Amino acid sequence: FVVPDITTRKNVGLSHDANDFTLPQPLDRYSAEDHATWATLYQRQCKLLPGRACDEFLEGLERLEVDADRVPDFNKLNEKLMAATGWKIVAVPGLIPDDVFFEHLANRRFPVTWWLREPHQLDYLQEPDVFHDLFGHVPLLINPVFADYLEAYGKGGVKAKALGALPMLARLYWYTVEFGLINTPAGMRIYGAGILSSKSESIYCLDSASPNRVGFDLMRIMNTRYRIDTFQKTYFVIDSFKQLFDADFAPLYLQLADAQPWGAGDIAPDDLVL
Ligand SMILES: C[C@H](O)[C@H](O)C1=Nc2c(nc(N)[nH]c2=O)NC1
Ligand SMILES: [Cl-]
Ligand SMILES: [Fe+3]
């Protein structure tokens, strides 16, 4: 007998596709309380991100008109997202298998957990919810180079076979799409979704002496461990989304397969550090 997780409780009486894990967005299951939780999260993040989020993120939020006051209707959002970027969101019950995830990204589908966090649980979150996925991840698709990066990432994941590739690709996604920073002429800014949807990470990642801030390096990153239950110990910094995009992985998985991974707090001899 155990504490059910929120994914299980939210999805009772609900089905999902056996192959691709999608379902129609269950609009009737958001409460008044949920729409208030959404508005509170949205308003809080939008006061923190001036000076912090990269310009492209802020542009996406505006161009997509992500709702400020209610959990968005995914079909309505998709009208704008498809026209502007060629991508669509699909509702998923929560975390889905890695192979299923890659197949969606490879086909310009972004999986979004449909349910929302409960009020006393507005942060420290580990599992995605609809605020993290829709507010954190989706707006950055307005940058076509980042969108193409995500599609390419997915196609690479579909193709990956070598033992050890899945952790390597998870680390790459984590230190870019979830927790990446970008150097800009106006100063260091944020692009990672796990930062942008979090009050605490948004502040910490640009205002703390403890973590390392390391220039992006693909092979380094694929061989670096990460932690889920704490603030990050290293952030990787890109100079441009083109650098990310410009980054066949098959020989790379083999080069790194027997390698000892770097710890989440380590500095490697070839790193460039801030
Ligand atoms: C990307 C890496 O494989 C990571 O373990 C995954 N992230 C996600 C996932 N599933 C969902 N719904 N969202 C994610 O962000 N499964 C796979
Ligand atoms: Cl491979
Ligand atoms: Fe995420």
Side-chain angles (χ1 to χ4, degrees), residues 20-147:
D20 70 17
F21 278 67
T22 60
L23 59 164
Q25 178 193 15
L27 296 165
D28 61 332
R29 296 191 166 212
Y30 302 119
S31 66
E33 169 165 298
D34 290 329
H35 297 307
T37 296
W38 176 277
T40 295
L41 294 163
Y42 182 96
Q43 84 172 334
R44 199 247 280 339
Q45 286 312 283
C46 285
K47 297 188 176 165
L48 296 172
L49 295 177
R52 295 195 174 84
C54 69
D55 290 342
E56 299 79 349
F57 182 78
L58 301 167
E59 170 186 337
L61 223 29
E62 299 195 26
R63 296 316 313 358
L64 299 178
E65 294 179 73
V66 170
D67 300 65
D69 23 30
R70 285 178 141 261
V71 182
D73 188 317
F74 298 179
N75 285 142
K76 284 180 161 100
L77 179 159
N78 273 341
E79 303 180 352
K80 298 179 180 111
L81 192 64
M82 284 155 97
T85 71
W87 281 72
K88 62 176 67 164
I89 61 179
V90 294
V92 295
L95 283 168
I96 66 189
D98 291 4
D99 63 321
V100 172
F101 187 79
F102 299 142
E103 176 67 15
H104 282 302
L105 297 195
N107 286 283
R108 299 185 284 185
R109 295 185 292 268
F110 192 87
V112 175
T113 294
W114 70 265
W115 52 263
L116 187 65
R117 67 192 74 179
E118 296 164 323
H120 55 93
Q121 10 163 291
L122 268 44
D123 197 22
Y124 292 138
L125 252 229
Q126 276 185 177
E127 14 173 339
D129 72 334
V130 68
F131 183 74
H132 161 74
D133 275 342
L134 214 51
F135 182 94
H137 279 285
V138 171
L140 206 57
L141 293 170
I142 204 74
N143 177 283
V145 175
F146 183 77

Side-chain angles (χ1 to χ4, degrees), residues 154-171:
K155 291 173 171 184
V158 169
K159 289 202 172 179
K161 292 293 164 196
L163 188 65
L166 294 178
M168 294 178 195
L169 289 175
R171 295 161 185 166

